[PDB]
């Protein structure tokens, strides 16, 4: 059976059955992550996806400078982060919490108030069972912190667990705790029915809020920085009115956030789900940032749930995660979340400035022009000279870039 | 001048400045994607992230069987997809559309009605110029299909463009078209002001709806399949009541969807943004699937916006994307979206069945027992033999798995 075959046997079988070509088999064999690691981490393993990784520059958070590992396939994301970080100069923490959530959900509950009374008088025993079900997190100074109770639909009761999982994302800790407590619940309440017991990825107790305050002159190379700031404010407010913009606005933010999450070995689906769900405010999907003009400064703020990890999951077992974490110089998960939120705000700034100025299309083209200048051998003032001239005609390629460079030499 | 340096020079500089260790530099150098490709795709390039890729099994969509490339770092995702697909047996398309969206947004509009009237009488010219701004897509049978107009509070007007981008995701086509039309708008309306012109990732005209119908006996190896089906229906209903569950429910779906999107070289942020926004219904974030009982069958349905690509972006320039596409063997992007939506529904089925039965933790450990057996060298009948013995006691690691394997071989 395929599940029980070695990776080599799996690839040989796919080729034999005509499901992949010999060239595809050879490419699937071209890997850099150890086969033993890859085949351990997932099931039915055959190969890997390689996502380019680069370095985001100029980010400063609470007066500490960072070099940001960013894994993405999308052109201009990393250059845009670097551009936004450089404009903003620095980011400051406004607020931060870090707890992870789980739930045990009962169903067919005749009297939710009565069930809640029986749970609430037993909270000390629940906390003791939570520790017994995962003792190591308590030893390390974390563990269950709070129990909350919600009733739904005259049938359901959610017992909400708020847990300090220290530097892990917390799925294994929380799920082990919940399974152990659910076993005790089944002993105590043999006639109540538990539907499921599972983590929640909606990590509303891991929200971090970061801000920046930018002199408006930094928003343009000319004298119209205030008029750019006013337009950034309008574009950000427009995301609160039109979900077709809000989705794209937040997608841009996530181009930066997801790139760091992926590079550091964190779970990209969990961050995406928590951030996009948090975008729903007052019943409408809206932007995750706010931009306002205060005096002669453009003020930006982001607020996102970032239950990120510096240990566990794929943060250590994948060697590239460890390499990215060395570059980023962060071992504390609270700090990781502050940095990642700042990346999202810097990314959004670069996007909004471009959108309301030359446009993102022209912004991409300017990056392409500079790349072409560098590829054909321009150095120093030559790079900006070739790139600026490339921008004056619509067709750009290496032949034209070299002709410009050689004409200038 | 980090953007000008070569990748090797970048890594040497980071080492020289004490920002990375020698061991980190060596690991960053351990790469399988061509440096020339990686350095041209992104900026400030130094290395790559490697995401394990496996094969999701048993998926059938509209009576065609598939083998699904899935790139993920999370244990159990691929085996869970395979389990859900096997239980479901097959998926059927309910409906599908495929158009991409962009917008030109005007601001400080004194009279939105008058502006819309002036644009609407000029649609032929808008259609003529959208072609001129990207003629290849029209030559290929695509292009602009519809213009819509929305006015807002605070003096904004959005001109909405609905575009057939054929097998591309469409960012380059749509953004080029919008830029060219915006130039024409500026010539026409000197007193109006355009705030921006950009695609929308909220691809509500690329929604696909897929369904499955499952005899309830298939939900348990015992005689209680109907009772499992009832609990799946209630767990799915609960996601309509509690956003704390809905987010996790949809995250599970996206473990499967994102794995295929990533493996095929598609943009994972775009799919995540469109799918999670689409989860908002009647002002509340809810599940992307529905499960009901009808005719002693468990009936599941998913509906997601999937503006996916089989050309462009990273679908061809990354060799692993082409390898994944060979394995998957879809004919066009519409078919890719149908398969990916079916993956999401199969994933959700496997998750809900486990949640209401033995629990996800027990399901993870059963898979870990087999994985440990294979990691230490078990083959054939040894895989299940080692795994079954591992589950009889508490310690789940490689040392114990190897001790069992060597003992069984004595
Ligand atoms: C210094 C470069 C200037 C131009 C530029 C700016 C940003 C990006 N990347 S982005 O922020 O990820 C991004 C991409 C596409 C988008 O549509 C959006 C959005 O609409 O908000 C955001 C790319 C180019
Ligand atoms: C045959 C395996 C049986 C057990 C099992 C089933 C599914 C998965 N993966 S999953 O669907 O991606 C997923 C993971 C974690 C989750 O909390 C959820 C959710 O809550 O919906 C979903 C893993 C294990
Ligand atoms: Ca079916």
Catalytic residue check, A166 = no
Q: State how far the Cα of B169 lies from the Cα of A197, in Å rounded to an integer.
A: 38
How far apart, in Å, are the Cα atoms of B57 and each of B80, B148, B359? 10, 42, 22
Tell me whether strands A193-200 and A143-152 are parallel, antiparallel or unpaired.
unpaired
Q: State how far the Cα of A256 lies from the Cα of A270, in Å rounded to an integer.
A: 15
Catalytic residue check, B364 = yes
Strands (E), A286-366: 289-294, 297-305
Q: Which two tokens stand for residue A364?
A: 């991409």
Strand order in the sheet with A92-96: A92-96, A207-215, A297-305, A289-294
Cβ-contact B86, B56 below 8 angstroms:
no
Calculate how far, in angstroms, residue B267's C-alpha sits from the geometric centre of ligand 1.
Answer: 14
Q: Which residue has the tokens 């690991």?
A: B27
Beta-bridged to residue A159, according to DSSP, are A104, A149
Cα within 13 Å of Cα(B21), Cβ side? 10
Q: State how far the Cα of B93 lies from the Cα of B212, in Å rounded to an integer.
A: 9
- Which residues 202-231 in chain A show a CB within 8 A of chain B? 202, 231
Beta-bridged to residue A69, according to DSSP, are A55
Q: Give the technique used to solve this structure.
A: X-ray
Cα within 13 Å of Cα(B289), Cβ side? 36
Q: State how far the Cα of A336 lies from the Cα of A309, in Å rounded to an integer.
A: 8
Q: State how far the Cα of A398 lies from the Cα of B320, in Å rounded to an integer.
A: 27
Cβ contacts of B15 within 8 Å, gap of 6 or more: B21, B22, B25
Helices (H), A140-224: 171-188
Nearest by Cα to B356 from B242, B227, B237, B216: B227
B242, B247, B273 ranked by CB distance to A254: nearest: B273
Q: State how far the Cα of A275 lies from the Cα of A62, in Å rounded to an integer.
A: 22
How far apart, in Å, are the Cα atoms of A206 and each of A18, A200, A246, A335, B7? 48, 12, 22, 12, 36
How far apart, in Å, are the Cα atoms of B328 and each of B59, B312, B325? 11, 17, 5
Calculate how far, in angstroms, residue B41's C-alpha sits from the geometric centre of ligand 2.
Answer: 34
Q: State how far the Cα of B191 lies from the Cα of B187, in Å rounded to an integer.
A: 10
The full DSSP string for A344-370 is HHHHHHHHHHHHHTT-HHHHHHHHHHH
Q: State how far the Cα of A238 lies from the Cα of A25, in Å rounded to an integer.
A: 49
Please measure the distance between the N-terminal and C-terminal CA atoms of chain B and give it in whole angstroms. Answer: 62
Cβ contacts of A215 within 8 Å, gap of 6 or more: A225, A296, A297
- For chain A, the maximum distance between any two Cα atoms, rounded to a whole number of angstroms, is 87
Q: Which residue has the tokens 């509209």?
A: B62
Q: State how far the Cα of B229 lies from the Cα of B217, in Å rounded to an integer.
A: 9
3-state secondary structure labels for all residues of chain B:
CCCCCCHHHHHHHHHHCCCCCHHHHHHHHCCCCCHHHHHHHCCCEEEEEEEEEEEECCCEECCEECCEEEECCCCCHHHHHHHHHHHHCCEEEEEECCCEEEEEEEECCCCHHHHHHHHHCCHHHHHHHHHHHCHHHHHCCCEEEEEEEEECHHHCEEEEEEEECCCCCCHHHHHHHHHHHHHHHHHHCCCCEEEEEEEECCCCCCEEEEEEEEEHHHHCCCCCHHHHHHHHHHHHHHHCCCHHHHHHHHHHHHHHHHHHHHHCCCCHHHHHHHHHHHCEECCEECCCEEEEEECCEEEEEEEEECCCCCCCCCCCCCHHHHHHHHHHCCCCHHHHHHHHHHHHHHHHHHHHHHHHCCCHHHHHHHHHHHHHHHHCCCCCHHHHHHHHHHCCCCCCCHHHHHHHHHHHHC
Check which CATH number belongs to the domain holding A382 and give it: 1.10.8.660
φ and ψ of A57, to 5 deg: -110, 160
Cβ contacts of B173 within 8 Å, gap of 6 or more: B100, B134, B137, B142, B163, B165
Q: State how far the Cα of B46 lies from the Cα of A51, in Å rounded to an integer.
A: 11
Q: Which residue has the tokens 């982060």?
A: A81
Q: What is the DSSP letter of A7?
A: H
| Residues comprising chain A, all counted | 409
* Domain range enclosing B401: 363-409
Q: State how far the Cα of A235 lies from the Cα of B222, in Å rounded to an integer.
A: 58
Rg (CA), chain B: 26
A46, A321, A379 ranked by CB distance to B54: nearest: A46
Rg (CA), chain A: 26
Calculate how far, in angstroms, residue A77's C-alpha sits from the geometric centre of ligand 1.
Answer: 7
The full DSSP string for A50-88 is EEEEEEEEEEEETTEEEEEEEE-SSTTHHHHHHHHHHHH
Catalytic residue check, B191 = no
- Which residues 48-77 in chain A show a CB within 8 A of chain B? 48-57, 67, 70-77
Chain centre to alpha carbon of residue A244: 21
How far apart, in Å, are the Cα atoms of A50 and each of A251, B51, B254? 22, 7, 20
Q: Which residue has the tokens 């009901």?
A: B292
Please measure the distance between the N-terminal and C-terminal CA atoms of chain A and give it in whole angstroms. Answer: 65
Check which CATH number belongs to the domain holding A112 and give it: 3.30.70.420
């Amino acid at each position: 059976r395929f599940y029980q075959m070695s990776p080599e046997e799996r690839l040989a079988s796919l080729l034999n059955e005509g499901q992949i070509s010999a060239d595809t088999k050879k490419e699937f064999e071209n890997t850099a992550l150890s086969s033993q690691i890859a085949n351990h981490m997932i099931e039915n393993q055959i190969s890997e996806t390689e996502v380019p990784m680069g370095v985001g520059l100029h980010l400063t958070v609470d007066e500490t400078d960072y070099l940001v590992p960013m894994a993405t396939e999308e052109p201009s994301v990393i250059a845009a982060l670097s551009n936004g970080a450089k404009i903003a100069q620095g980011f400051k923490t406004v607020n931060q919490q870090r707890l992870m959530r789980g739930q045990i959900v009962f169903y067919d509950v005749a009297d939710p108030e009565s069930l809640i009374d029986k749970l609430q008088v037993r909270e000390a025993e629940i906390f003791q069972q939570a520790e017994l079900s995962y003792p190591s997190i308590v030893k390390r100074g974390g563990g269950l912190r709070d129990l909350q109770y919600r009733a739904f639909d005259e049938s359901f009761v959610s017992v909400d667990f708020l847990v300090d999982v220290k530097d892990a994302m917390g799925a294994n800790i929380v799920n082990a705790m919940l399974e152990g407590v659910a076993e005790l619940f089944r002993e105590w309440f043999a006639e109540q029915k538990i539907l499921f017991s599972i983590l929640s990825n909606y990590a509303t107790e891991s929200v971090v809020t970061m801000k920046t305050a930018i002199p408006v002159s930094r928003l343009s190379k000319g004298s119209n920085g205030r008029e750019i700031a006013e337009k950034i404010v309008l574009a950000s407010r427009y995301a609160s009115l039109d979900p077709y913009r809000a989705v794209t606005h937040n997608k841009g933010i996530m181009n930066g956030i997801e790139a760091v999450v992926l590079a550091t070995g964190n779970d990209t689906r969990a961050v995406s789900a928590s951030c996009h769900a948090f975008a729903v405010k007052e019943g409408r999907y809206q932007g995750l940032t706010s931009w306002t003009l205060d005096g002669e400064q453009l003020i930006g703020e982001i607020s996102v749930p970032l239950a990120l990890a510096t240990v566990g999951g794929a943060t250590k077992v994948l060697p590239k995660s460890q390499a990215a974490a060395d570059l980023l110089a962060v071992t504390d998960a609270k700090e990781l979340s502050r940095v990642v939120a700042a990346v999202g705000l810097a990314q959004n700034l670069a996007a909004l400035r471009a959108l309301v100025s030359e446009g993102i299309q022209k912004g991409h083209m300017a990056l392409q022009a500079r790349s072409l200048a560098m590829t054909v051998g321009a150095t120093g003032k030559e790079v900006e000279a070739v790139a600026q001239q490339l921008k004056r005609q619509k067709t750009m390629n290496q032949d034209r870039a070299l002709a410009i460079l050689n004409d200038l030499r």
